[PDB]
XYZ file of C-alpha atoms in Angstrom:
14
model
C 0.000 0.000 0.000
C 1.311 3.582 -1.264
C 1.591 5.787 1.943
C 1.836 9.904 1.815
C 4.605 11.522 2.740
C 2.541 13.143 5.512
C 1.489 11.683 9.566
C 0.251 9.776 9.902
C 0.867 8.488 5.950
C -1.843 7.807 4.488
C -1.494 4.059 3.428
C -3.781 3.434 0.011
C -4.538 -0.539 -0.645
C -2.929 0.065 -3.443
């Protein structure tokens, strides 16, 4: 899962 640079990251499923 593709997290953002930001916290907490935001984790995407993908």
């Amino acid at each position: 899962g593709r997290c953002t640079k930001s916290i907490p990251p935001i984790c995407f499923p993908d």
